[PDB]
């Protein structure tokens, strides 16, 4: 198969960095997965692992060594291996991990390791403030447990796998999707965070609010 592309880091805003890792999925090629590192003074917090422990350890080392703001804690945006494939690395590297109770239960069922701490959002529309970020459960979409994360200083909305890349018509991995609610969940996220000017999908490049509108259109019933 083709070589797996290396992990990448790019600055999205003041104190906000995108991590990207790659996986070769036969019989095709590399697929990216994106998460964030967010600076919090003298430490940082992480949104999502990469695909596996080795990529995730590289991300932790980058925060410690380049930002000099080591990762203290992390949040995971649903129970799939692009988001939770590196949990064992986080736990060994002393990162305190958080996910919803539903995500943790699905992780165990799906062969992934659960996070150490529960985020108490479980009803549609529930929000909490966590390490300066707003975390919203908008309802099931790409996965029943999918959550989104807003960084209100730079106005960056992390949509994760609930937001599809660019102007795609492909729905990606829908094995666990709530096809009936997905478009409404995208609308819920868009309405909850109207000021965010940058939107990050897991599997494509950073964009504007047009990827919210495009995802909502392509996943509509
Ligand atoms: Zn997924
Ligand atoms: Zn994904």
Strand partners, 68: none
The ligand whose atoms approach the alpha carbon of 177 most closely is: 1
CA of 42 to the centre of ligand 1 (A): 31
SS3 9: strand
Fill in the DSSP letter of residue 116. Answer: S
The phi and psi torsions of 211 (rounded to 5 degrees) equal -75, -20
Enumerate domains of the chain plus CATH numbers.
Answer: 1-221 (3.60.15.10)
The ligand whose atoms approach the alpha carbon of 204 most closely is: 2
Query: Which token pair is 42?
Result: 């003298």
Exp. method? X-ray
Gaps in the chain after residue (C–N beyond 2.5 Å):
none
Listed residue (111, 68, 118) closest to 97, CA to CA:
118
Cβ contacts of residue 63 below 8 Å, gap of 6+? Answer: 37, 44, 46, 69, 70, 71
* String of DSSP letters for 28-49: S-EEEEEEEEEE-SSSEEEE--
Distance between alpha carbon 186 and the CA centroid of its chain, in Å? Answer: 15
Beta strands in the chain (DSSP E): 8-13, 16-24, 30-39, 44-47, 71-75, 96-100, 117-119, 127-130, 133-136, 148-151, 156-160, 198-201
CA of 63 to the centre of ligand 2 (A): 23
The ligand whose atoms approach the alpha carbon of 175 most closely is: 1
- What is the experimental resolution, given in Å to one decimal place? 1.5
CA atoms within 13 A on the CB side of 188: 22
Cβ contacts of residue 154 below 8 Å, gap of 6+? Answer: 12, 13, 14, 15, 16, 198
By DSSP bridging, strand 117-119 and strand 96-100 are parallel
Residue with tokens 């995730």: 56
């Amino acid at each position: 198969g083709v070589a797996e592309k290396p992990v990448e880091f790019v600055k999205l805003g003041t104190g906000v960095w995108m991590h990207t890792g790659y996986k070769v999925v036969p019989p095709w090629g590399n697929i990216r997965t994106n998460g964030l590192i967010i600076e919090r003074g003298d430490y940082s917090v992480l949104v999502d692992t990469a695909w596996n422990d080795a990529q995730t350890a590289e991300i932790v080392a980058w925060a410690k060594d380049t930002l000099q703001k080591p990762i203290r804690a992390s949040i995971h945006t649903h129970a799939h291996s692009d988001k939770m494939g590196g949990m064992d690395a986080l736990h060994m590297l002393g990162v305190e991990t958080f996910a919803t109770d539903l995500t943790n239960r699905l992780a165990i069922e799906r062969g992934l390791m659960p996070a150490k701490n529960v985020l108490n959002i479980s009803e549609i529309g529930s929000q909490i403030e966590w390490e300066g970020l707003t975390i919203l459960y908008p309802g099931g979409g790409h996965s029943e447990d999918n959550i989104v994360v807003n960084e209100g200083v730079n106005n960056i909305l992390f949509g994760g796998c609930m937001i599809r890349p660019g102007m795609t018509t492909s729905l990606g991995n829908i094995d666990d999707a709530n096809l009936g609610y997905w478009s409404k969940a995208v609308e819920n996220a868009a309405n909850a965070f109207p000021d965010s000017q940058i939107v990050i999908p897991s599997h494509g490049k950073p964009a504007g609010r047009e990827i919210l509108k495009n995802t909502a259109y392509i996943t509509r019933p």
